[PDB]
Every structure is written in structure tokens, then in C-alpha cells.
Amino acid sequence: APAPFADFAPPVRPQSTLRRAITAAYRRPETECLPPLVEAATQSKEIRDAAASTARKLIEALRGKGVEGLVQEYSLSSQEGVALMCLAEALLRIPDTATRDALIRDKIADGNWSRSLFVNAATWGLVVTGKLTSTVNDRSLAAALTRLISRCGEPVIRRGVDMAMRMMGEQFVTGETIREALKRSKELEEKGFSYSYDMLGEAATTAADAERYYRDYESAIHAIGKASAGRGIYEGPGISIKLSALHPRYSRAQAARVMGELLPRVKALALLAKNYDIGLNIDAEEADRLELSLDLLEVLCLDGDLSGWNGMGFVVQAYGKRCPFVLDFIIDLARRSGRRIMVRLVKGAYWDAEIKRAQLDGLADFPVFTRKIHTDVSYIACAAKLLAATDVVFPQFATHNAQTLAAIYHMAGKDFHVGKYEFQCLHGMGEPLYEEVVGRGKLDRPCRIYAPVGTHETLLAYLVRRLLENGANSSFVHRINDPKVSIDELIADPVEVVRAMPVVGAKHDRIALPAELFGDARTNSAGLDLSNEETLASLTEALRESAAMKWTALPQLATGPAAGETRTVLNPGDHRDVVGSVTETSEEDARRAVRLAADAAPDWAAVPPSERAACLDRAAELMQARMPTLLGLIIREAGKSALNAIAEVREAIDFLRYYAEQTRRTLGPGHGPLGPIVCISPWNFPLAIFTGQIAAALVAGNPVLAKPAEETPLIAAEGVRILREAGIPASALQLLPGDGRVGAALVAAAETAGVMFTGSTEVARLIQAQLADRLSPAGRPIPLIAETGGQNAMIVDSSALAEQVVGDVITSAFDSAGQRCSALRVLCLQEDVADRILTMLKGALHELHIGRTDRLSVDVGPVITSEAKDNIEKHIERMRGLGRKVEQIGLASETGVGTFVPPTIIELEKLSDLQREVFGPVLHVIRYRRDDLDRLVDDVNATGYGLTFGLHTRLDETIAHVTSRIKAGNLYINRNIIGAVVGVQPFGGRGLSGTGPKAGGPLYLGRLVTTAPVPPQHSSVHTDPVLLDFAKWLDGKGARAEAEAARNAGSSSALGLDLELPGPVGERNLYTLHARGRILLVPATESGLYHQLAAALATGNSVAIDAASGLQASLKNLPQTVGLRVSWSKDWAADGPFAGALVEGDAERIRAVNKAIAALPGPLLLVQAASSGEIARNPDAYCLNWLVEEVSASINTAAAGGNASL
Amino acid sequence: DDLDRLVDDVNATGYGLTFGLHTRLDETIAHVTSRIKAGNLYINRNIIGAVVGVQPFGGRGLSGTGPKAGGPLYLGRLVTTAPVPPQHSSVHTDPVLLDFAKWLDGKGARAEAEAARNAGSSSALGLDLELPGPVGERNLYTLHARGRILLVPATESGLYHQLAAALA
Amino acid sequence: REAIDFLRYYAEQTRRTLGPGHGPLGPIVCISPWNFPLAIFTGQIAAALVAGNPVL
Ligand SMILES: Cc1cc2nc3c(=O)[nH]c(=O)nc-3n(C[C@H](O)[C@H](O)[C@H](O)COP(=O)(O)OP(=O)(O)OC[C@H]3O[C@@H](n4cnc5c(N)ncnc54)[C@H](O)[C@@H]3O)c2cc1C
Ligand SMILES: NC(=O)c1ccc[n+]([C@@H]2O[C@H](COP(=O)([O-])OP(=O)(O)OC[C@H]3O[C@@H](n4cnc5c(N)ncnc54)[C@H](O)[C@@H]3O)[C@@H](O)[C@H]2O)c1
Ligand SMILES: COc1ccc(CO)cc1
């Protein structure tokens, strides 16, 4: 048996001093990065004066010289221009130019114009307006297209087709094929330009895609080398490649596959480039790939088979904090290898994405600068370093910024020869600038044009966004065309502007560090960067040390540890790996624990809320400090990967801090505790959900009996140890390890005042049935918060981006071996794109690494137990036996020592083929016709579940349709459907998925006290109109007090609350309160009924009223608006599902009704009960908090390949 | 406490042209503007002097037929085939229209089901625009349901199309 | 002012929307009141005219 974590993440090679200097700078504070850059970029006054003059002359030339003229000629609105260009693009998809012309003339121009015409309207919107949107208003565009065609007819359509042709075939790309691009390059090559060709391609998701990009590159190298015809690496053309195009798993976590599989591919291409003596440049991609790419560069430059060739090139991004240290490494590598490495200095293309990623991952700082002027100084500083090393490297200064250009032109001085350095620019953007540079009549410096090649609609869209800087106001390309921006502004020297600032290198004031995402409310949890070699080295040691510890879990009662039966805890991924020992709780001691909690309840309720919250905050600090050790335990006890364990510890920290802050915002002495709360937690989030339930109950003033899942007691014991260390008294937090019999004893105990349960719907139903026999001392039902299964779907239409879909599906379905309650279970693919997406999904499936999770390279770990494995596999085999197509990855023999299920894709005929939640790595796929979208949504709702739901579409009309009809608590647009963030996507659903309130949301604590507080921002100015009609009807009937109570309910309701929650950039996180549905009303008196009806109507609900109440004659002559919401039910089980219940009666009647409600099939109903007297005395007898439904929606607004606002 | 009945009394005249509300309270604004049935609403200002293309002018009931003068639907009433007005669209689809279309598909009425879905998309119900105007004022223009439409069909398919149009 | 604005607004709406398939009704009778004897007079007439209809 391999020692745990002995091979967790060994580096490709021992890290040299130069490599460690790079890693040290990864997230260095911006105020520390800039001063040495300012120093290195400093030039003499005479040079600065000369550069400003040259920059002014270039900009004057640039300003002294398509779609805009088309918009002018036909008086098009912006939307008409966008719509016209979408039409033109589609018409160009028709090959036969004659068949197209007759379509325009005889069909389109008249009045009759598988995929929306407007799938790429975001791209054209950027072309037309300079602004990027994530999604497109396809109804607006359709209206605009109809309007413009009916107004201007065939002429405007032909003009649009001509314009789209000129842009898509001549301005965005140098050619559609490498042969065409090479032919079109002769003109500027005669004028002194050179070329670097980019076969559009990146981010391979499958082996097949990586192989396709490989043969694209190989064929392009042959064509470029044939055309170069011996011109060599400086005067002749070269190629640019992206490493992510050549392997579907290009990441540090997969470094072994990268070195073993990607490296030989790059070597083979470079050998071909060597034979033709052309340049081969490695483009720079995301920040977490920088240092990995250096390992490939080093191996390539030291490989003797490539000797004799100086065409290897490498991009370095000056917006990156490591840039100068990367350059030091490359210059030294050039000296060691004797190869004159071609170094392309760029600013960088992924800025918006890097900001969002660092925020999502909770890392210390950004790996890029946050002020644009800092990147400019960085670039000039790095240019000075390169210009000092032209003997050993070939600098290539890629920029369209005339100030940057002029600074470097003058920095380089008067001595020039071809091969010393060059400038570079992008095709169809840089030529106007660089035609003022190239040639003896200008500045006589060469420029290499980066020349995109292809027709790839997706990659074409990616490029147009890169070419237009995602529509950024800070970009030179935008500012050069901005008449409000003077030339003096454009030639401002960034070095001296930065030097003059109060704090040199201060972070952008409007971008939050990841720790500061929530401002003054609370401190964001911190993650770990698994691409950082220093982090990986330190984590390896911490993880090894965690595995040497003798972890234990014992019954921890208020009186001390208790004795019991002890057994070992085994690693689910390798049962030979003993993780620790658990001593399990006797039923008698479980009962004793509840009595001890009851005895201690007044003492804990007496601790002021802010001090209870301080315990949670202290526990959060402890968990953060202990994160590496906690990771190791979670990895081995629960079978989780490192990344998932980090996210879990982060979530536990976030729960602690969020409930602490919510307590500080809300709780006072009048919000009395329930009493002892039984917290029953699952094995799949054995720290986060465990901690969240307990922290909420504790901070609300209740003592807790914590019953962890039998599979994962050790991390629970560690969580309790930390909470107790943080100041939670032992009498307030007791740990009761064991199986469901321990849970059952706790639930049944007479002093149990509330139960928080996360687990299966079936166990939740058993708990509900036991609780229904009891009442609180105040004669109310015992509160149950139950978060249960999901049958979570994602709907993908033909406008979605397949590569994005595939990544989000693989992650949502198979992360944590599908053992997330939020996991994607049913993928619904529009028929027109189903086959292409399914092919990619199957290819991506086979790139997953399944195994014991103490290796960074493992993507998917084991399932928790042999019983789990057996249950999942029985489902797969039943599906397979029914003739459904089943795709599975083959598992390695090493998995035989643990309990693994291979990630599996099952193609279903109908959603009804799936009858129950299968809690494992099993994705079901169905196809749908576009016109059946609404029925599909009905079918998704018909499962009875409602937890998570995903939608991938670019079309606003589809977003509005689907999100208005789906009934789920957590919606995700154009992103994965997992990993809900506390206070950002408050988490919890409806129906079979649970009772609410949402964990990590603002209604949670209020369920854990006897008088609910007003949550922060919890109000609505909306009044339900049927409530208002009902209140008028009451007044008409003479029920004056009830009418007043109804109006008051209408005002007090928070129905219609519509909030945006603070979160990361590039995402919009919305939180809304809706009606729950149909509420079961069980009144005893006429006035009781009227109060119940007002409560339900004020929160937007319809009702079913118990016909056995005999109160039918109390609702005579209802307004139709109210009557439409009222039904009468004799057989409650026949008239559901309900979404809640209101009950009136004395204690015996409440108990009898509560038991009858627990027997209703389907969802667990949140039941509220009150006596007739309580209804008369207490305006809040029924709490409106529990009569609305919380919905969280998270929209990825970077999904159109850019962040507009940022 | 009689505010809602007062709004009913105002609506009960059968007219619905201009209406003013003076209040500092958002809940009263939301309440009253959601219940009054008048074509031109004014909040914390006078109720006269509608500005062309800023307060498109005209009401409902006994106040007239529409479309609003000085608004984007006006010219379409004066031609035999109405054009698509500027900015005239909505991403909202009426859910009962959608339920009707599914029912039509269930009955095998595939042509009417497609017609119903197309009406659902073509409807501008839910349009919610801010019109350009002076500073210190917000001028909003919205498209709502009209109410109950009288359907006088002759054939089953005609009824399905009329119902789709009204539901959409 | 209102008469001026009707004229310019219906002119702009025409430029934004009307094409050959938006055929006129024919003669439109425009009946106007004494309380806005220029503005409502002009508004009704301008709209009818610019939509391509002759006006009484
Ligand atoms: C020939 C060529 C090849 C290129 N190859 C690559 C490559 O392999 N990898 C890659 O990542 N990029 C590459 N780029 C660069 C990228 O695609 C953009 O073209 C480049 O960053 C624009 O810089 P500029 O000097 O033209 O314009 P500018 O307007 O001067 O600079 C804009 C740049 O500033 C940076 N920036 C913007 N806002 C901020 C901010 N708030 N804080 C900090 N920085 C900010 C960004 O890097 C942005 O692109 C290449 C560019 C060219 C011309
Ligand atoms: N909605 C959510 O937020 C959420 C989150 C995580 C997991 N889940 C659900 O959790 C389920 C998987 O977790 P699980 O396997 O641990 O669920 P589960 O029902 O198997 O186990 C949960 C807990 O209930 C206990 N238990 C079992 N029988 C009991 C009984 N008769 N009385 C009292 N307690 C009893 C177990 O000991 C365990 O601690 C899935 O259905 C999943 O969807 C939901
Ligand atoms: C727009 O020019 C670019 C060239 C290369 C890259 C590498 O990702 C990005 C942009």
C-alpha cells in the first residue's frame, strides 16, 4: 500500500533559484511589484521627449485616416445593425452564391425571414456598438430585423452580406485556410511585414479535438515552411500555437500527462518547424499555465534533436506579476541552451478572466495587475530587460499602443539590424499603425503580423473579443477612436504618471481582493492555489503529516467522553488505508445527551448573541489556519479530491462567518431559542454541512446534539473540537457518532426542540413522521429543516457554446463522483446539437483520472461505501439491460482496493425512464425538440424535486421562459450547477428537495428561534393583489378585524423581494422571494380561516381548504380573483402536492392534523399551527417567512467570453 | 385603510385617462399604481401637459380606444399592415399561452400550436421602457394585458388562433 | 410646442418604421376639439398624413 500523499504533487523538476523567484512573485502585492518596474522603465528626459513626439506623430497619422457607414446610409438603429449582421452571417453560411441571391430576393426581402439567427449577436453587438453583452435579446433583434427589412428591403440585406463577407473573410482572419492566408500575405510581405499564423484553436476538450488541432498545426507548418522558402526565422513567416489546443488536460494537476503526452507533440511540431527553419511560438494562456509551460520550454530548448534551430518562441505577458522573473529564467535558459529564444512581449489577453478566477478561488491576490497603467509600466520595464539581452534572445514587441511603441523604439536606440528585435501586431488592427513604422520611409523597424486562420465560428467569436479588447474603455484601440480623448492624453507617459501617484502600485479601487468580496459584512474564506509550487510543496508535507495522525471520534457528552463500541474508519478509495477510529454512541447515551442539552439550554441561551457569534468567528479562524490538515482528513476519510476538500473547508468557514454576521445583524433577547437541536448531517459534505447546521443552531442560542454520518465521524469530531476550542461549551455542543439508530434516538427524545437534517428524502420522511407525534411546550410543531435529494437537470439549447457546456457538464455530473446533492443528473440537449455535444462529452469523460484521492492528478475519487457502489452499479446495469446506451470510463486495477464507480453516461429515451435519485457519477442524457422546451420543463418539474437547475443559452427569451417555468431553488445560467457559495447562492430547494429555509441564506437563523427576527434587507414594496381583493371582500362581509389583519399581512409579506447579492465579478447572483405554491389550510373557526387565507394570499399562494372544517359557508360570493386561488379538499392526499400548511386548533387537534399531514405523499410540508386564541392575540401567529419560497439564480456574465463592466 | 376601495371608486367611473399620486412612500406608489387603471400616471407632479414621446398620451375604458397619441403604436393604426415600432418587443412569454400551445400539441393541432407559440414570441406584452426626457423625471412606458377580449369565432381553428392571440 | 412635437415625432417614427408594405387606409376624417385647437388638430392630421393617407 502506497504511503498516503507520498506522490501527491511532485514537481516536474527540482525548482531552480530562477524558478522559485518566478513562483514567489505569483501573487505579490501590487504596491511591491510596481516600484522596481518604475525604476527599470525609467528613461532620460531627452528620450521621453523624443518618444512623446514620435507617439504624437504616429497617433496623428492614425487619426488622419464600414459597419458605421452602413448604419449611417440606412439609418439603422444599433439593434438593426446587429440583427442585419446576424442575418448576413447566416446567409453566408449558404455556399451557392446564386442560391443565396435568390433566397434574399425571393424570400428574405419580401417578408418571411435549428438555431436562432442571433446566436452570435453578442459578437456583432461588439462590432456595432463597442459593447459586450453575455446574452442577446433575441426578441429585440427579431423585431429589429423585421423592421429594417420591411423598411429597406433587399438593398440593405445585400449591403450587410457584403459587409459581413469583408469582415469575416478579410478583417478578422487573414484567410479561411492557411493556403489563402499565405496568398494574401504576399502584399504586406513586399512592404516589409512578416507574419505569424494562428490556426484558430485552443482549449481542447477531447483527445479527438487535440488531435484535430495537432494536424491543423502540422499541415500549417508544412504550408508556411513551403511558402517561407528558406527566408529563415526572422525575415520569413512563422506559426503560433496554443498548448491547450494540443492536449485536453493541459494543467499543473495533470503535469505527468502533460510531460508524457503533450511535450512529444510539441517536439514533433517543433522538429518540423526546424526542418523548414521557421518560427514556432508558444502563445501564453491563463496564469495557472504559465509555470507549467516553462517546463515544456525548458525540455524543448535542452533537447538535442531541436539543436541548430533558433525559431522556438515563447510569449510572456506583461500584465502578469511574474513577467520580469519569467524573462530572467528565459534569458538564462537561452544562455544554457545556446538558443536565441524568440520572446514575444505582450500585455495579456485574459485579464477579466484572471480577476474573476482569483476571486472565485479566494486566493491572496491577483496574478495580474489591476490598473491598466501598471501593465503599461510593466511592459516598458520588461522591454528594457529584453533590449539588454538581444545577443541571447530575440525580442518581439507586440502592441498596438503608439505610446508603448514609441517608448520602446527610442529605448532601443539607433543601432538596428533585421534580427535584433521586431514589433508585432494583430491582423486587421495593427496595419494602420505599423504602416507608419515599417520601411525606410517610416521608422524602418519590422513588424510581424499575427494572422488568424480559419472559419471556426466559436474561435472566430473568441478572436473578435480579443481583437476588440472585450470592449474596454481603457484600451488604446477604444481610446484612439474616442474623440473625447486628446492626443496629449494618449501620449501620457505611464512610467511618470505612476511615479507621481500617492501610493505607487495601489490596487484598483473598484476591484475587491478575494478576501474582501463581502466588504464590511464578513471576511471571505481563503483558498489555496494548487498551481503554486510552493503551496504544493508545503501542502504535500501538511497532508503527509495529517495522515500520520491517530484521528479519533468519540461520543462527547456534556459530562465528558463516553464509552462505546469502537471501529476503524477506512479510506473509501483504499480500505487498506486506516484513517482513524470511531467510538459510537449507545442509544442510552444519546438520550442522556439530549437531557444534558436541555439542562444546559438556559445557560447557552444566556450568552449574548454577539458573543455566540464571536465563537463562530473564532472557529472560522481556527478552521482557516488548520485548512491543510483538515484537507488531508477530508481527502482520506470522505474520498474527496484536494480541490473539493479545499472548497469544503472554505464552505465551513463561510457558514461560520455568515451565520455570525447574520446573528450580529438580527438576534436580540426577544428571539428566544427553541431548545436542544438535533443536527443530523451527511457523509458527502462531512465538514461543511455538519458545521453549517450546528453553527446556525448554536448561534441562534440552542444547544446542539451533533450526529454525523456513520461514514465520516472523524472530520466531525475535529469540527466539534474546533468549535469547543473557539469557546462553545461542551454542554452546548455534544458529538454523538453512530448510525441511524443514534439519529433516531435523538429525534425521538422528549426534549428535542428541533431537528436539522441533511440527507435522503426517505430518512427525512421517517424523521418527519416521528416529529409529528410531538409538540413544543408552546404547543407548536417541532421544527424540521430538511435538505434532501435532487434530480437536477441542465437544459442546453443550440445557442450554447459546446466547449463551455462540456466542461460544466463534466464538472457538475462527476465532481466528487457525483456525490453532491446539487450534481447534474439529467442533461437535456436540443436535438440539433445533441450529437456533437454528446460526442464531446464522451471524449471528455475518458480524460478523467479516477483513483485514490491523495494524488493531485485524481479528478474523481471513490464513492463512499460498497453499498453505495452496489446501488449505483445496479442502476447502471438495469439501464444497460433495458437497451439504453451506456458509456463508461475503464477503471485502473488499483481501484480494486476501494469502492469506485466509473463516471457513466446513460442515454435515456424519456425523463420518466429515471425514477429515483442515483447518488453517484451517473449522467443521464435526453434530447428534445426546440418546440417541446416548455413540455420538457414540465417533465423536469414532474420529478417532484427542485434543488439545482442549469440552463445554457445565449438567448434572453429562452432564459426568461425557462427560468419563469422551472421550479427549483438554485438556478444557474451558463455555468456549472454545483458549489453554491454561502451568502451568494443561498442553497436549498423545494418539493422533494426539502423544506427550506435555504442554508447560507438570510431566513435560516429565523427558523431556529421561537420568534423570528427581521432578516437584513428582508422586505418588499409589492402587495399581492388577490390579498387586497380578499381584504376588501372581508370588509364587505363585515369581518373588519380580519380585513385589517389581511391588509397588514399584505404589507408585512416579503413576497417580491428581489436582491442582488455581493459576489465575484463576471457573475450576477440574484435572490428572490416567490410564492410557495398551494398551501393546505386546516382551519377550525371562520376567523381562523380568514387569517389563514390572508396569510397565504399575502405571500402569493393559492390554497386548498380542509372541507371537513365545515366552513364552506364562510366564503360566499368571493371575488373571482380570490376564488381562482381557493379550492376545497376532502382527500388531502389526492389534491396535492402542497407547499406548506396552516393549522388552527388546540394541542390535540394540532397533533392529529400534523400526523395526517406527515402521511401525505410527496414533499415534506412546512406546517405552522396556532390556537384560535393565538390567532386572536398574535398578528404573527403564522409567520410569513415560511410561506414564501426562496430562489437563488447565478448567472455567468462572462460567458460571452468577456466581462463588459470590468 | 380605505385606499384600495378608493382606487376601486376611481376606476368605477369607467374612465381611465390621467391619474396622479402624491406620496413619499414607495409601498403606496407600488400599491396604487398596480391597482389604478389609467393610461397616464403621474407621481409627485401635476397630471396634465403630456409631452410627445415622453408621456405618450391616452387611456382606456370610457377614455377612448388607443393607441396613445405621441406614442409608438399610433402610426400603425393608420396603415393596413402595421409596422414593428422602435424598441417594440418583449422577452416575456405569457405562461397561459404556453399552456394553450401544449394543449394544442396534445390534441394534434400542430399548425395552431405553432401559430400559438409564434404569437407568444411576437407579443410585446411585458415591454418596460424608460423614455428620454428631462432630468429630474423618470418617464416609463409599459405594455400590459388589455383585459377580457371578446372572441367572436366562426370555426374551431379560428377560435384557436383568436385565443392564442388574446392569451399571448 | 406640442403641435411641433407631434409633427417631428410622427416624422421620426415614420422614418423608423414605414416601408412600401405598410399601405395606407385611404381618406381619414380628423375631427378635433376646441380645447387643444392646434395641438390635437395637428397631431391627428400629421399622423394620418405621414402614414400616407389624405385627410379631411
Ligand atoms: C501579435 C500579438 C500577439 C499576442 N499574443 C498573446 C498571447 O500569446 N497571450 C496573451 O495573453 N496575449 C497576447 N497578446 C495581447 C492581447 O491579445 C492584447 O492584444 C494586448 O494585451 C493589447 O495590448 P496593447 O499594447 O495593444 O493595448 P493597450 O490598450 O495598450 O493595452 C491593453 C491591455 O492592458 C491590460 N489591461 C487592461 N485593463 C487592465 C487593468 N484594469 N489592469 C491591468 N491590466 C489591464 C490587458 O492586458 C489589455 O489587453 C498578443 C498581442 C499581439 C499584438
Ligand atoms: N439539499 C441539500 O443541501 C443536500 C446536501 C447534501 C446531501 N443531500 C442529500 O443527502 C443524501 C445523501 O446523504 P446521506 O447518504 O448521508 O443521506 P442519508 O439519509 O443517508 O443520511 C443522512 C443522515 O441521516 C442519518 N439517519 C439515517 N437513518 C436515520 C433515521 N431512521 N433516523 C434519524 N437519522 C437517520 C444518517 O446516520 C446520516 O447521518 C442525498 O440524497 C443528497 O441529495 C442534500
Ligand atoms: C488577440 O491576439 C492573441 C494572440 C494570442 C493569444 C493567446 O491566447 C491571445 C490573443
Query: Distance (Å, rounded) from C-alpha A274 to C-alpha A609?
Result: 71
Identify the burial level of A55 via C-beta atoms within 10 angstroms of its C-beta, where 0-12 means exposed, 13-18 middle and 19 or more buried. buried
Given a contact cutoff of 8 angstroms between Cβ atoms, the answer to whether A60 and A353 are in contact is no
Closest partner residue to B93 among A146, A960, A1035, by Cβ? A960
In which element (H, E) is residue A98 found? Answer: helix A97-103
Q: How many residues belong to chain B?
A: 168
* CA dihedral sign, ordered B140, B145, B146, B147: negative
Provide the 10 A C-beta neighbour count for residue A65.
8
Given a contact cutoff of 8 angstroms between Cβ atoms, the answer to whether A533 and A550 are in contact is no
In which element (H, E) is residue A95 found? Answer: none
* CA dihedral sign, ordered A1106, A1108, A1110, A1112: positive
Given a contact cutoff of 8 angstroms between Cβ atoms, the answer to whether A1015 and A1002 are in contact is yes
Rg (CA), chain C: 12
C46 touches chain B (CB under 8 A): no
B124-142: buried (b, 16+ CB within 10 Å) or exposed (e) per residue? bbbbeeebeeeeeeebebe
**A1203 ligand 1 Cβ < 6 A:** no
**Of A332, A349, A350, nearest in space to A341 by CA:** A332
Residues contacting A1060, CB < 8 A, separation 6+: A1068, A1069, A1070, A1071
Amino acid at the residue A56: R
Phi and psi at B67, nearest 5°, equal: -70, 170
Given a contact cutoff of 8 angstroms between Cβ atoms, the answer to whether A1009 and A1045 are in contact is no
Bridge partners (DSSP) listed for residue A553 = A582
Closest partner residue to C48 among B78, B83, B86, by Cβ? B78
Query: Distance (Å, rounded) from C-alpha A213 to C-alpha A204?
Result: 8
C18 touches chain A (CB under 8 A): yes
Amino acid at the residue A1161: P
Q: B75, C16: Cβ pair inside 8 Å?
A: no
**In chain C, which residue's Cα lies nearest the Cα of A145?**
C17
- List of chain A residues whose C-beta atoms are within 8 Å of the C-beta of residue B92: 960, 964
Q: C15, A75: Cβ pair inside 8 Å?
A: yes
Residues contacting C5, CB < 8 A, separation 6+: B51, B52, B53, B70
In which element (H, E) is residue A317 found? Answer: strand A312-317
Q: In Å, what is the CA distance from A380 to each residue of A410, A476, A791?
A: 11, 16, 54
> A261: number of CA atoms within 13 Å, CB side?
17
DSSP A11: -
A576 touches chain B (CB under 8 A): no
SS3 of residue B49 by DSSP = coil
B37 touches chain A (CB under 8 A): no
- Sole residue written with cell 511592459: A379
> A589: number of CA atoms within 13 Å, CB side?
23
**In chain A, which residue's Cα lies nearest the Cα of B87?**
A140
Residues contacting C47, CB < 8 A, separation 6+: B69, B74, B75, B78, C6, C10
Can you read off the three cell numbers belonging to residue A1086? 371562520
Residues contacting A844, CB < 8 A, separation 6+: A205, A206, A248, A806, A807, A810
Rg (CA), chain A: 33
**A1074 ligand 1 Cβ < 6 A:** no
CATH class in words for A533-787: alpha beta
Given a contact cutoff of 8 angstroms between Cβ atoms, the answer to whether A542 and A629 are in contact is yes
Helix axes A263-276, A290-302, angle to 10 degrees: 50
Specify the pairing of strand A447-453 against strand A193-199: parallel
Given a contact cutoff of 8 angstroms between Cβ atoms, the answer to whether B66 and B75 are in contact is no
SS3 of residue A1060 by DSSP = strand
Can you read off the three cell numbers belonging to residue A105? 430576393
Task: Tally C-beta pairs within 8 A across A and B.
Answer: 73
Region at B166 (left for phi over 0; alpha for psi -120 to 50; beta for the rest): alpha
Identify the burial level of A716 via C-beta atoms within 10 angstroms of its C-beta, where 0-12 means exposed, 13-18 middle and 19 or more buried. buried
Q: Mutating which of A71, A72, A147, A151 best tests the C interface, going by the most C Cβ atoms within 10 A?
A: A151
Q: In Å, what is the CA distance from A354 to each residue of A346, A859, A960, A1202?
A: 16, 23, 29, 11
B17-56: buried (b, 16+ CB within 10 Å) or exposed (e) per residue? bbbbbeeeeeebbebbeebbbbbbbbbeeebeebbbbbbb
Q: A111, C21: Cβ pair inside 8 Å?
A: yes
Show the CA angle centred on residue A969, arms to residues A1025 and A981, nearest 5°: 125
Amino acid at the residue A764: A
Show the CA angle centred on residue A1196, arms to residues A1195 and A1199, nearest 5°: 140
Can you read off the three cell numbers belonging to residue A956? 434572453
**Of A659, A596, A652, A655, nearest in space to A624 by CA:** A652
Query: Distance (Å, rounded) from C-alpha A816 to C-alpha A202?
Result: 27
C51 touches chain A (CB under 8 A): no
Specify the pairing of strand A904-907 against strand A885-888: antiparallel
C35 touches chain B (CB under 8 A): no
Can you read off the three cell numbers belonging to residue A312? 522556438
Closest partner residue to B83 among C17, C28, C48, by Cβ? C17
Specify the pairing of strand A1140-1144 against strand A885-888: unpaired
B69-92: buried (b, 16+ CB within 10 Å) or exposed (e) per residue? bbbbbbbbebbeeebbbbbbbbbb
Amino acid at the residue A18: L
Expressed in angstroms and rounded, the spacing between residue A758 Cα and the centre of ligand 2 is 5
Can you read off the three cell numbers belonging to residue A1148? 390535540
Bridge partners (DSSP) listed for residue A1193 = A971, A1070
Measured in whole angstroms, how far is the alpha carbon of residue A949 from the centre of its chain? Answer: 14
Long-range contacts of A169-173 (CB under 8 A, 24+ apart): A170/A428, A171/A66, A171/A428, A172/A428, A172/A452, A172/A460, A172/A463, A172/A464, A172/A467, A173/A200, A173/A427, A173/A428, A173/A451, A173/A452, A173/A453, A173/A454, A173/A455, A173/A460, A173/A463
Provide the 10 A C-beta neighbour count for residue A24.
14
Given a contact cutoff of 8 angstroms between Cβ atoms, the answer to whether A860 and A850 are in contact is yes
On the question of a cis peptide bond just before residue A1137, with omega within 30 degrees of 0, the verdict is yes
- List of chain B residues whose C-beta atoms are within 8 Å of the C-beta of residue C38: none
Query: Distance (Å, rounded) from C-alpha A866 to C-alpha A881?
Result: 22
CATH fold for domain A793-1011+1195-1206: Aldehyde Dehydrogenase; Chain A, domain 2 (3.40.309)
Given a contact cutoff of 8 angstroms between Cβ atoms, the answer to whether A1036 and A997 are in contact is no
Query: Distance (Å, rounded) from C-alpha A1019 to C-alpha B53?
Result: 35
Find the largest Cα–Cα distance for chain B.
55
Catalytic residue from among A787, A957, A1042, A1190? A787
Given a contact cutoff of 8 angstroms between Cβ atoms, the answer to whether A339 and A313 are in contact is no
Measured in whole angstroms, how far is the alpha carbon of residue A1026 from the centre of its chain? Answer: 39
SS3 of residue A1055 by DSSP = coil
For residue A142, the distance in angstroms to the closest alpha carbon of chain C comes to: 14
DSSP A262: I
Q: Which of A58, A283, A288, A346 best tests ligand 1's pocket when mutated (most atoms within 8 Å of CB)?
A: A346
Bridge partners (DSSP) listed for residue A193 = A447
Q: B70, C14: Cβ pair inside 8 Å?
A: no
Bridge partners (DSSP) listed for residue A1065 = none
**A211 noted as active-site residue:** no
Q: What atom in ligand 1 is closest to the CA of residue A374?
A: 43
Residues contacting A941, CB < 8 A, separation 6+: A965, A966, A967
On the question of a cis peptide bond just before residue B67, with omega within 30 degrees of 0, the verdict is yes
Query: Distance (Å, rounded) from C-alpha A1035 to C-alpha A1041?
Result: 9
Given a contact cutoff of 8 angstroms between Cβ atoms, the answer to whether A958 and A119 are in contact is no
- Within 929-948 of A, beta carbons closer than 8 Å to B belong to 931, 934-935, 938
DSSP A782: P
Q: In Å, what is the CA distance from A294 to each residue of A187, A325, A379?
A: 36, 12, 20
Measured in whole angstroms, how far is the alpha carbon of residue A1075 from the centre of its chain? Answer: 27
On the question of a cis peptide bond just before residue A1002, with omega within 30 degrees of 0, the verdict is no
SS3 of residue A875 by DSSP = helix
A964 touches chain B (CB under 8 A): yes
Q: Whose CA is nearest to atom 22 of ligand 2?
A: A759
Phi and psi at A394, nearest 5°, equal: -110, 100
Amino acid at the residue A701: G
- Ligand at shortest distance from the CA of A319: 1
Sequence-ordered strand ranges (E) for A944-984: 948-952, 970-973
DSSP A557: E
Identify the burial level of A527 via C-beta atoms within 10 angstroms of its C-beta, where 0-12 means exposed, 13-18 middle and 19 or more buried. buried
Q: In Å, what is the CA distance from A798 to each residue of A116, A464, A567, A571?
A: 8, 21, 53, 43
Query: Distance (Å, rounded) from C-alpha A737 to C-alpha A1170?
Result: 36
- Sole residue written with cell 500585455: A347
Region at A316 (left for phi over 0; alpha for psi -120 to 50; beta for the rest): beta
**Of A152, A169, A133, nearest in space to A80 by CA:** A152
DSSP A1112: G
Query: Distance (Å, rounded) from C-alpha A297 to C-alpha A735?
Result: 54
Q: Whose CA is nearest to atom 38 of ligand 1?
A: A372
Residues contacting A147, CB < 8 A, separation 6+: A80, B83, B84, B86, C16, C17
Give all strands of the β-sheet with A1188-1196 in edge-to-edge order.
Answer: A885-888, A904-907, A922-928, A824-830, A792-796, A948-952, A970-973, A1188-1196, A1067-1075, A1058-1061
What determination technique applies here? X-ray
**A821 noted as active-site residue:** yes
Expressed in angstroms and rounded, the spacing between residue A265 Cα and the centre of ligand 3 is 21
